[PDB]
Amino acid sequence: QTIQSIPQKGFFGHPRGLGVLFFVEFWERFSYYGMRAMLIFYMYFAIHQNGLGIDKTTAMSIMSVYGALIYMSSIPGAWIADRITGTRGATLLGAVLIIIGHICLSLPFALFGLFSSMFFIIIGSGLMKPNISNIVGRLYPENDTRIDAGFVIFYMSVNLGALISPIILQHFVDIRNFHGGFLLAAIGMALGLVWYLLFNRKNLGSVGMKPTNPLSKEEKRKYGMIIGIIVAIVIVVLLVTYYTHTLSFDLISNTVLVLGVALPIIYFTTMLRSKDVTDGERSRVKAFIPLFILGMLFWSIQEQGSNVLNIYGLERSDMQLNLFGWTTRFGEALFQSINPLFILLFAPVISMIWLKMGKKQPSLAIKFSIGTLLAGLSYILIGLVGLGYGHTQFSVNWVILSYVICVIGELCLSPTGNSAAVKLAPKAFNAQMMSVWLLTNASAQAINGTLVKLIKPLGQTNYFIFLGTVAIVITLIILVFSPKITK
Ligand SMILES: NCC(=O)CCC(=O)O
């Protein structure tokens, strides 16, 4: 038994192991969301300002494509643990790769440093993210009611790291010491790796030491050829385009846009066409399709807060916080701390609003629509602000007010989507359903990479009013089918 080899207490009433992973995840998410806060500015800032001097649209496009690929990599990375290394092996190798990625940015390699960094982080975060989360769940026995609260505590390290890292790294942006800030994230991640290596054999026992579905002798040959050939085709395409001098980021953004739109269709077609899924379970897979649209329209506007909304506020607002007499210069990296702070403060509040009601609470469709409609209205607000003022430098309060409207929308969509990924899931397609919920983010981010190109032709202000209305009109159309969708 997996439980007969591990401690069942030791961390706020949960297995001692939950304590180890909280510290490992805190330091990984801290270095990830910290590095992410500085990268956008590191890319488009001038050479004299220690930046890379990349086109505003290209730097904006790289962020959305980087993000998409991190979430897409969880699909083959959950496969490698399930079929080759086990969850422990993939977590460890993934962590070692992430460290190399942060170190790449600390070195003066400019573009070679940026692209090699991205490549190390994309691979590592696909091997580490879905498998570290798997071990948390595996620390609890079959008939153990604590597991739900264990994940609430586990995802607290996620928002703690995301909240603290941009506050700390704001000084490294101010003094233009980018390499120093990326080095801080690299060392920050090393503390995670050390804490795992020091305290993991005793707290996590034999849980995740071997794959669940190991590959047989023939499967090692079969998959080895397919993966080997696909890798070989990619290597040549990038090398031939490079030396001819025709290689650009459009090749990356277009390939990812194809994957972003193709992957959801493939999973839904596989699940629907399956002979294992019952007619009752098939109606739930059909009912999750309009929820996926609502989830994509949400994560599209929400993830633009990391590359579009923060640059808007930096360039068009006064960047001066002003609440009831208290005034201070607002840092550009501190826009990344709004969401995690509002999740930490108001997550248990919204969790109790639904508990107070019980049977009288709204459906998954009403909840998804409220979240998407708010995200849409967040873009109407900031778009109208700019339309009203124009050339007049408005307050940073209008930008912060936009971030708040979106996180209030997330507090309705994130806990609903987590329950939807497991409840609506068929018996034989539980992992395949976890993929369709996480692909709402990977697809939105893959769309964004190309959607940022429409900022220059339409205009920065007009871009906000259009995206806001596109999200609202489509959310209201799906809302007319609220009694039909609830099956
Ligand atoms: N759980 C992490 C978040 O939702 C915060 C993302 C952000 O920093 O914008």
Numbering used by the authors: 9 to 495
Provide the authors' original text about this structure.
Recently we discovered a prokaryotic homolog of PepT1 from the bacterium Staphylococcus hominis, PepTSh, which was able to transport a natural thioalcohol-conjugated peptide, exhibiting structural characteristics similar to prodrug molecules. PepT1 and PepT2 belong to the much larger POT or PTR family of proton-coupled oligopeptide transporters, with homologs found in all domains of life except the archaea. To address this question and understand how peptide-based prodrugs and nonproteinogenic drug molecules are recognized and transported via the SLC15 family, we determined the crystal structure of a bacterial POT family member in complex with both valacyclovir and 5-aminolevulinic acid at 3.1-Å and 2.5-Å resolution, respectively.
We successfully captured PepTSh in complex with 5-aminolevulinic acid and determined two structures at 2.5-Å and 2.8-Å resolution, respectively. Five-aminolevulinic acid is an endogenous nonprotein amino acid that forms the first part of the porphyrin synthesis pathway in mammals and is used in the clinic for the photo dynamic detection and treatment of cancer. PepTSh adopts an almost identical inward open state observed previously, with an rmsd of 0.305 Å over 480 Cα atoms compared with the valacyclovir structure. The 5-aminolevulinic acid molecule sits in a similar position as the l-valine scaffold in valacyclovir, adopting a vertical orientation. Five-aminolevulinic acid does not contain a peptide bond, having a ketomethylene group instead. The amino terminal group in contrast sits in a similar position to the carboxyl group of valacyclovir, interacting with N167. Of particular interest was the observation that 5-aminolevulinic acid adopted a vertical orientation as opposed to the horizontal one adopted by dipeptides in PepTSt.
